[PDB]
Amino acid sequence: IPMDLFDFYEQMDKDEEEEEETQTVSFEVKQEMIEELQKRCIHLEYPLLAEYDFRNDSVNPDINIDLKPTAVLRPYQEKSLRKMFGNGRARSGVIVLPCGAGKSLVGVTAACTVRKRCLVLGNSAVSVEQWKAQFKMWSTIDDSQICRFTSDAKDKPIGCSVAISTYSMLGHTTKRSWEAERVMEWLKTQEWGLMILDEVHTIPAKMFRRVLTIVQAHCKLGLTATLVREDDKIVDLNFLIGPKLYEANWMELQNNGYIAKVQCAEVWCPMSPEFYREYVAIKTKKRILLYTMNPNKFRACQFLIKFHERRNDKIIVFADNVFALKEYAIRLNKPYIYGPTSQGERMQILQNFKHNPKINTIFISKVGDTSFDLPEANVLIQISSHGGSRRQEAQRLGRVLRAKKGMVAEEYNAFFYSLVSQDTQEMAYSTKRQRFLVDQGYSFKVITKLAGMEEEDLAFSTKEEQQQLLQKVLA
Amino acid sequence: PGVLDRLYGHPATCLAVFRELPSLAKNWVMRMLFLKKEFSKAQEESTGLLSGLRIWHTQLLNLRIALLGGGKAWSDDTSQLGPDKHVLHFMVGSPSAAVSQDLAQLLSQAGLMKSTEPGEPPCITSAGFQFLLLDTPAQLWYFMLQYLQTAQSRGMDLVEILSFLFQLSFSTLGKDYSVEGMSDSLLNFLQHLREFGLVFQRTDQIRLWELERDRLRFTEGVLYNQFLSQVDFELLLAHARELGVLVFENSAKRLMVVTPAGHSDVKRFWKRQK
Amino acid sequence: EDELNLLVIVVDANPIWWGKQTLSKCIDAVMVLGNSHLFMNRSNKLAVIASHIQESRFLYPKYELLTSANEVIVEEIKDLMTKSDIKGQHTETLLAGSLAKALCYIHRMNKEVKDNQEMKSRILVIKAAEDSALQYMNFMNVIFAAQKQNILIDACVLDSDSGLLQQACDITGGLYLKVPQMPSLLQYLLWVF
Amino acid sequence: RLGMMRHLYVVVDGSRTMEDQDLKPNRLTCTLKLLEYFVEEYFDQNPISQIGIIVTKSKRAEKLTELSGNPRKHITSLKKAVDMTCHGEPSLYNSLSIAMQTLKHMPGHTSREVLIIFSSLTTCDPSNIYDLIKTLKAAKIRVSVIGLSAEVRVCTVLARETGGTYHVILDESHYKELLTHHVSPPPA
Amino acid sequence: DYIYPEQFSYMRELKRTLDAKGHGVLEMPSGTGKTVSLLALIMAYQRAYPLEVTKLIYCSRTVPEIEKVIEELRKLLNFYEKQEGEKLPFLGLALSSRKNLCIHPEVTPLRFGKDVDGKCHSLTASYVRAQYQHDTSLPHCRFYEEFDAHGREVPLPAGIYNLDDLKALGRRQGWCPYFLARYSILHANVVVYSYHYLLDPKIADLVSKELARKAVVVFDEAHNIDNVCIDSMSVNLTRRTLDRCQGNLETLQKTVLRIKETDEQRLRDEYRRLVEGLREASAARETDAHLANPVLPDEVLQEAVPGSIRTAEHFLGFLRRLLEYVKWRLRVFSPLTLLANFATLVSTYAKGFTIIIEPFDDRTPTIANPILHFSCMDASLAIKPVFERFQSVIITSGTLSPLDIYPKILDFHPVTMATFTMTLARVCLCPMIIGRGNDQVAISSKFETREDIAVIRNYGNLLLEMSAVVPDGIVAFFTSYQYMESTVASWYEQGILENIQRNKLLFIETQDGAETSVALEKYQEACENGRGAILLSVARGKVSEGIDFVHHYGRAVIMFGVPYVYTQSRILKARLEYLRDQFQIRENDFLTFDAMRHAAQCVGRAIRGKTDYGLMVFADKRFARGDKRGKLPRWIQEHLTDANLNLTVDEGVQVAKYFLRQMAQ
Amino acid sequence: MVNVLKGVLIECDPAMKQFLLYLDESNALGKKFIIQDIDDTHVFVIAELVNVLQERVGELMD
DNA sequence: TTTTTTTCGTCTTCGGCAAT
DNA sequence: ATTGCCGAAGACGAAAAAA
């Protein structure tokens, strides 16, 4: 019976003296006792099923957060907190929802419900500043106990939620990676007990994974929309944070004056003289530029901007590369936003795009993704398949796009487009993209021709024009 | 009563007039059907007569009993008529008529067993050349012939009927070709054969239309022509490919042109004469 | 087949048939229709009545009976052919009398059936003739009786104008069809009702 | 059936509450469709008769068909009404006054009838409706109401006082039973 | 010649429930059939004992309910004799206060010191003086020879009198109708009148004088008996009534033979000195005055002995007798009510009263002033005379199946009996509402009287969703006017910021009997709105009387808040303490259950009985507590009924589905 | 002018693939046999036997 | 000067390209 | 059929300007 049972720490492992012979592990591996990774503590179901239990004799009895107030979440988000009360730590650990519908609120509520000494992990200071703005109803004595805790200073019991910090490892003053042995953990190194991770996909990377791996970490919750990069690490995240409690929030459940029905499309474009000579012959990182700048595909992108500007729709055009961004945008003479565009000029372009009926198309680089207040529109065009993440295409679509007025309850009232060059490595991304969007509940189709592109003025009207671009791209 | 002959007569007239070339008769024959009919009909021209012959048995479906027996009486006359008459259209008519008499159950199994008509249905059934349209009436006749026999205890015909066995080679063909219609007809024969004598005998798909398109991709099998002696012989030989519609390309400044393989020979012949 | 069904066919004998030019054919067709009707179910029965100019008369009396029915009908009609009430000598027919006979028979059959379960019956009139004012009270009396009885009276007008019959179907909830193309008689009988 | 002649004024509720999906999407579609079935069945059983059609909509009365003996006008009017739908609230008093004006003209042995399909709860008319009900009973104009899920007392009294036919309809099957009850003639 | 199958089934058991000769409790329907079936069940005993024949008396809350008892009982008798009658050769007759029956006697002697008892004395005095000699100049034109005339005598037994129609008879004729009834009371087998008259032991002694023989009393809606009995038992004094009695004694010319140290006027001054000094010292905003507090200011000021006080009490009676004879020759009562209140004060009634003084009206230079009384804390002592040997009782309230509260209130154990055949649960539907998603947090009701967000959210919004969706005539009951005013913005809003916009009608204070009917005419005629229709009313208020229309004028009632009550920091607080000492479990019995019956009367009045149908919804956070102990109508009546359950994932849909089911029936 | 005839296969292509074929022709092993000549930018005279290879190789190649 | 704004520099994921 | 050594692109502090 476990009334005497010791349990202790060595470098990244838990060893269990004079044992109760617990299920699901090897025995006398190198001594009479059981020995697991720290990170295996998460498997509380394997003892719970057996009817086994354990005690935290290493406890520290100091004080904790109360945060008694409540607020109102979206109808699936509440169902999602309700479930978490239901399931408990044996059968909980991540939630997936867009970066534009209430993820900050799920984190402050997840900490106010769970109610333990908490450390909040985030990607960015702006997101700390948005979580502070969310958290003001729970904040103790409004503004006299909230503080930041990162590379310049630390103070107070709370802040953006409870104490927030960043994932970073540049040196001794990052935030979470350097401190990973000092505090956290109620069961050993026992100052705190609860972990809340915003942007949770960020942690299972090869160096970062160690922050999570080198503890027992009692309670853990993660929140994300991108969830994984193109190589799919996500089997690891079940171990590292916990299993996935939720994924859906389909626009099928929020149509009639609720949000927006998106017609998704992929566009197959043919390939014009000289560009495949050179695509086929070049194996280097330049070849990405011949399939993105393919003038038949540029003419589809131009034709599509013209159709939706003729109807006065608002359009964001995404370009994965600053070269591509500027070659498309300067030709189409639409503003662009990227790293080196300043805050003053970005807020002028974005205010113009949202409120000026003359400024209806803009071009944007990777800087929108992960922490950025992208504006509203009704049309999204991606000039390329990029291998960033199929799941980030759906986060980006979901934050940016809304219903066009009066048609607010129809089958579609917003539009997404991804442009693909036929007979290239750009095509490989489609059978995955298509399967992921339809599994996310989206109506998605393939458009393979445009015989009305043969009825109007567009660029690259000759071989000589196309040759002028081909020489510039090759250089 | 007097009206009866007159009214029906007018349609008899109409059928008579456009009797020869096409297939006008079918609709009119049906009307005619209701209102020694067979004996009298026999004198009239064959086509159309057969049409009337075909539909009348169908139309039967007390006094009715009398009608069937009456029909049975001159089943021979129609049978004599059926043979002797024996295009695809005619052929369709003869078996359709025979089939119809068969369902009526008026025909004598004996007599039918040894007759040219049964040989003729399997003959067309055997030949690959026959069209789908002839096939379906031939098939139907066979099915009906077997249907007619609800015994086989006394039915010599269910011997000749065995002639279906010959059909398997035909079904192999037909299968080789993508002729679904023909195969289905075969199966009906088999199934019907077994029936009579059974006692005696012991998104996702988006990539699938793309994978279909990956099996089609172009080029042409082709003769090129060069080193032409003077421009008049390019232009003659070129114009004589263009009227044959088998120019794939031409360039008068090269004195060079291309013909796909199917009109190599009409060009080789024109190059020899003129 | 669970429900016994009696279909009474009243045939208008009027010499209007002369205009028809044929009665013999009409009989043949009616016979075919009857045979089919009897064949459909064991429980089906048929009664045939002739509404002649002078009076109404019973044609015959199950499908096993059909042979009997055929003979009885052919013979009965031939007797009817008599010269009196010839051509439009008499335009009208005694439908009221025929309907009365039909309801009596239906009633008798029903009582016997009452011993058992319910019976369903409907009356079909093949009408050649014209209605007359004198006829109105008598015909309507029979019609209303049928409606109360909930016995539908269907009518197939080969020719002539019997308004009362048209009204009869409406009240009765039956079906009325004025046939274009009288030779299509068989189709109407089978298809129409 | 023949014996006498009927005059019937069919009155339909074209108020907004009628555009509700509770019965045949927007009650309007299910009621007009069954009412077309009723006209042909009533005209059949009642070959010597007349009907006229009125609606109450957007706080007024409108004449969809004039009083006549040809069924075709009334099914064509029920077809033409469905496209223009329903909005607003009843005008029952003005509809009983136009119906009264047509019905008063009719001779001694013919019936006087008003059939109302009702999905509202009151009516917009200022005029005193009780004076008009007293006048219907003197004139021998009988008024029947088929209501949808509704028993509001002035309508029920109005149908009882004029002759005894306030009925409730809860399905498309029940509404066909009620109209088919009306198809039935009066005694003579 | 017959009676109901129900009466036959439950007669023997009801005769047995009656045999115990002292008490019993009876379960009956929500109202339709209850009172008539009682008369049918007393037909079994209309002459149980020939040598004494007991009588029936019925107690009633208001005058319109009395005409409902008379009209039903008039149908049942059809006449006093076999000549036209066939169940009961009985005589029955309505009654109510002299204050209601007679207008001219209220009008003519216009003075503050003019009690309704005193006015009968005055009218009697004018009648005797006129008879003596004084007919030409002094009768009060309402009492004379018509009192004993045959024409006056006949309508009462021929007719079987209604109270309203006795008042209509009584005006025009100009004869005091109350006295003719009071003379007539002994001949009658049955009587219908007030609960406020009967519960009062001193009036009960005079009521029993008029009956002249033993009887049974039936309390219809008997949960009212306790609040009426303490209101009626308690007595009080008023500063203006002494200031008038003092002028009247000085006008009498006092006396001429009290000893030099004292006089009647000086003695009043001693008494008045004590009460006047408590007016300054005691209370202004609130009180906590006990039966202990009065004696000490009496004892210090007077410096007296008993002999002297006994004499001062005797000398007060003698000034009062002089005054009473002197009032009588005047023919148009404070010296009497002062003689006695002072006698009770020097004596006792400490086993049954406690003296309180209460804030006055200042405020203004008025004379109503702080009021002083002998407040009856608890009814139990006051009720006892009902059970005593000249009588027996029987109690009912429609439903009462959980039984316990009545024996709790009585401190006696009646014979119990359920004595009607009930109908299936399915004709009724009893919903509760609180919210439908997890974000619906505005209904904490820690301060429901102050929670604006909660009033604006499902309290205002669910009402509008339910009323707009369920388009029928529906009355929304509220716990107070202030809630009612905040919830419906109406035409007349308490603020610009209020959250219902829809055509409803109001039912506010200064209700008027004629104005009430206008609103019920509107609700019965058409549209959502009217009285009992889409209209707001507080559940305590007059709409609870209802209307006796045949038409099912009501459909749904939505109680916006569960009807709840409070407990004033005075005599009521003293009562809460007593019942805590005795029961423990006092709060649910003393307040919650008593408020839920307040609810149940209004819903009972909507659905009426077995021959009707209906639903009734409750809006509250704490509503499960209300569902336990069968404190609402939802509770058991017959095991075979297949339950009266209300749980659903959506109330509004379930009631519209239930209305389709009801149209189908 | 019927001087010379040559059986060959005529490949019609767009302004982006024919270039790949030429590249296929050179820089290849066992190749360079493939294209007879470039008649037009769009069309080439090529192969015969090679056509199966050219198509397949193009398929396999991007 | 203080305080703020830019560029520089370090750690790390990911797609090729040789080399065992 | 695996290890192992570039180049490219992105993110976070911190040093260096600039006032």
What gap in Å lies between CA A242 and CA A237, rounded to an integer?
7
Residue burial B98-135, b: 16+ Cβ < 10 Å; e: rest = bbbbbbbebbebeebbebebbebbbebbbeeebeeebb
Rounded CA–C1' distance between A283 and G20, in angstroms: 25
Q: Does B6 touch chain C (CB under 8 A)?
A: yes
Quote the DSSP letter at residue B229.
S
What gap in Å lies between CA E476 and CA E490, rounded to an integer?
14
Q: Which residues of A touch B212 (CB under 8 A)?
A: none
In CATH terms, the superfamily for domain E429-664 is P-loop containing nucleotide triphosphate hydrolases (3.40.50.300)
Please give the full DSSP string across E6-19, using - where no structure is assigned: HHHHTHHHHHHHHH
- Asked if strand H contacts A171 at the CB level, meaning under 7 A, the answer is yes
Q: Does B266 touch chain F (CB under 8 A)?
A: no
Rounded CA–C1' distance between A153 and G1, in angstroms: 24
Same domain, B91 and B8: yes
Instruction: Among F5, F51, F59, select the one facing B225 at the smallest CB separation.
Output: F5
Q: Which chains touch E (3 or more CB pairs under 8 A)?
A: A, D
Interface probe for F, chosen from B224, B264, B269, B270 (most Cβ of F below 10 Å), is B224
Q: Do chains C and A touch (3 or more CB pairs under 8 A)?
A: no
Closest CA to A243 of A225, A213, A221: A221
What gap in Å lies between CA A54 and CA D55, rounded to an integer?
78
Q: At what angle do helices D153-162 and D129-139 cross, to 10 degrees?
A: 20
- The gap from C-alpha B192 to its chain's centroid, in whole angstroms, comes to 20
Are D2 and C140 in contact (CB < 8 Å)? yes
What gap in Å lies between CA D140 and CA D111, rounded to an integer?
8
Are E437 and A78 in contact (CB < 8 Å)? yes
- Which nucleotide in the DNA or RNA is closest to residue A208, CA to C1'? G12
CB C72 within 8 A of CB C117: no
Structural domain for C61, as ranges: 4-193
Bin A16: left if φ > 0, else alpha if -120 < ψ < 50, else beta. Answer: beta
Q: Domains plus CATH for chain A?
A: 2-50 (no CATH), 75-249 (3.40.50.300), 254-474 (3.40.50.300)
CB D42 within 8 A of CB D49: yes
The answer to whether A399 is a known ligand-binding residue is yes
Closest CA to A368 of A390, A344, A336: A336
Strand partners, A420: A268
Q: Which residues of A touch B203 (CB under 8 A)?
A: 434, 438
Are A272 and F62 in contact (CB < 8 Å)? no
What gap in Å lies between CA B244 and CA B234, rounded to an integer?
15
Residue in chain B closest to C37 (alpha carbons) equals B62
Quote the tokens at residue E350: 């400490």
What gap in Å lies between CA E552 and CA E559, rounded to an integer?
19
What gap in Å lies between CA C103 and CA E387, rounded to an integer?
79
Structural domain for B89, as ranges: 2-195
- Asked if strand H contacts A177 at the CB level, meaning under 7 A, the answer is no
Q: Does D156 touch chain C (CB under 8 A)?
A: no
**Going by C-beta distance under 8 Å and a sequence separation of 6 or more, which residues neighbour residue E555?**
E470, E472, E473, E474, E614, E615
Q: Which residues of B touch C25 (CB under 8 A)?
A: 1, 4, 35
Quote the DSSP letter at residue A377.
B
Rounded CA–C1' distance between A285 and G15, in angstroms: 9
Strand partners, E216: E56, E392
What gap in Å lies between CA E380 and CA C174, rounded to an integer?
80
What gap in Å lies between CA E25 and CA E17, rounded to an integer?
8
CB B188 within 8 A of CB B143: yes
Same domain, B171 and B226: no
Rounded CA–C1' distance between A352 and H18, in angstroms: 33
Quote the DSSP letter at residue A39.
G
Residue in chain F closest to B232 (alpha carbons) equals F1
CA torsion angle E137 E140 E145 E147 (round to 10): -170
Strand partners, E25: E395, E416
Quote the tokens at residue E396: 């009912």
Quote the tokens at residue E563: 């009807």
Q: Between A and B, how many CB-CB pairs are < 8 A?
A: 5
Rounded CA–C1' distance between A317 and H9, in angstroms: 21
Measured in angstroms, the CA of F62 and the nearest CA of chain A are apart by 5
- CATH code for the domain of B244: 3.30.70.2610
- Which nucleotide in the DNA or RNA is closest to residue A366, CA to C1'? H10
- CA-CA-CA-CA torsion sign (E178, E181, E185, E189): negative
The answer to whether A339 is a known ligand-binding residue is no
CB E357 within 8 A of CB E297: no
The answer to whether E34 is a known ligand-binding residue is yes
CB E125 within 8 A of CB E107: no
Are F15 and A425 in contact (CB < 8 Å)? no
Rounded CA–C1' distance between A367 and H17, in angstroms: 27
Rounded CA–C1' distance between A212 and H15, in angstroms: 32
Cβ–Cβ contacts within 10 Å for residue C164, how many?
Answer: 21
Where do the structural domains in chain F lie, given as residue ranges? 4-62
Quote the DSSP letter at residue C116.
S
Per-residue CB contacts under 7 A with strand H, chain A residues 151-170: 151-152, 166-168, 170
What gap in Å lies between CA E159 and CA E171, rounded to an integer?
18
What gap in Å lies between CA E554 and CA E558, rounded to an integer?
12
The answer to whether E376 is a known ligand-binding residue is no
* Deposited resolution, Å: 10.0
Measured in angstroms, the CA of D114 and the nearest CA of chain C are apart by 22
What gap in Å lies between CA A238 and CA A235, rounded to an integer?
6
Chain F 34-53, CB below 8 Å of chain A: which residues?
41
Are D45 and C171 in contact (CB < 8 Å)? yes
Q: Do chains B and D touch (3 or more CB pairs under 8 A)?
A: no
Closest CA to B49 of B19, B76, B79, B73: B19
The answer to whether A97 is a known ligand-binding residue is yes
- The gap from C-alpha C101 to its chain's centroid, in whole angstroms, comes to 11
Chain A 73-132, CB below 8 Å of chain B: which residues?
none
Q: Which chains touch A (3 or more CB pairs under 8 A)?
A: B, E, F
Are C186 and B34 in contact (CB < 8 Å)? yes
DSSP H helical segments within chain C, as ranges? 17-20, 23-40, 66-80, 95-115, 135-149, 163-172, 185-187
Are B206 and A438 in contact (CB < 8 Å)? no
Are B203 and A438 in contact (CB < 8 Å)? yes
What gap in Å lies between CA B229 and CA F1, rounded to an integer?
4
The answer to whether E176 is a known ligand-binding residue is yes
- CA-CA-CA-CA torsion sign (E316, E317, E322, E327): positive
Q: Between B and C, how many CB-CB pairs are < 8 A?
A: 44
Cβ–Cβ contacts within 10 Å for residue C120, how many?
Answer: 16
- Hey, is B162 helix, strand or coil? helix
Nucleotides of strand H under 7 angstroms from a protein beta carbon: 8-14
Are B1 and C34 in contact (CB < 8 Å)? no
Query: The tokens 């139907």 sit on which residue?
Result: B140
Polymer length in residues for chain B: 274
Are D45 and C173 in contact (CB < 8 Å)? yes
What gap in Å lies between CA A267 and CA E660, rounded to an integer?
53
Q: Terminal CA-to-CA distance of chain A, rounded, Å?
A: 75
Interface probe for A, chosen from B209, B210, B211, B212 (most Cβ of A below 10 Å), is B210
Q: Between A and E, how many CB-CB pairs are < 8 A?
A: 14
Q: Does E247 touch chain D (CB under 8 A)?
A: no
What gap in Å lies between CA E162 and CA E179, rounded to an integer?
15
Residue type, E49: Y
Please give the full DSSP string across A61-80, using - where no structure is assigned: --------------HHHHHH
What gap in Å lies between CA B257 and CA E625, rounded to an integer?
100
What gap in Å lies between CA E423 and CA C94, rounded to an integer?
61
- Hey, is B207 helix, strand or coil? helix
Rounded CA–C1' distance between A177 and H14, in angstroms: 18
In CATH terms, the superfamily for domain F4-62 is TFB5-like (3.30.70.1220)
CB E221 within 8 A of CB E340: no
**Going by C-beta distance under 8 Å and a sequence separation of 6 or more, which residues neighbour residue A328?**
A298, A301, A317, A319, A363, A383
Are C32 and B63 in contact (CB < 8 Å)? yes
Same domain, B104 and B186: yes
Closest CA to C95 of C138, C126, C51, C127: C51
List of protein residues whose beta carbon is under 7 A from strand G:
A 169-171, 177, 205-208, 229-231, 283-285, 387
Q: Domains plus CATH for chain D?
A: 15-183 (3.40.50.410)
Report the nearest residue to nucleotide G16, CA vs C1': A284
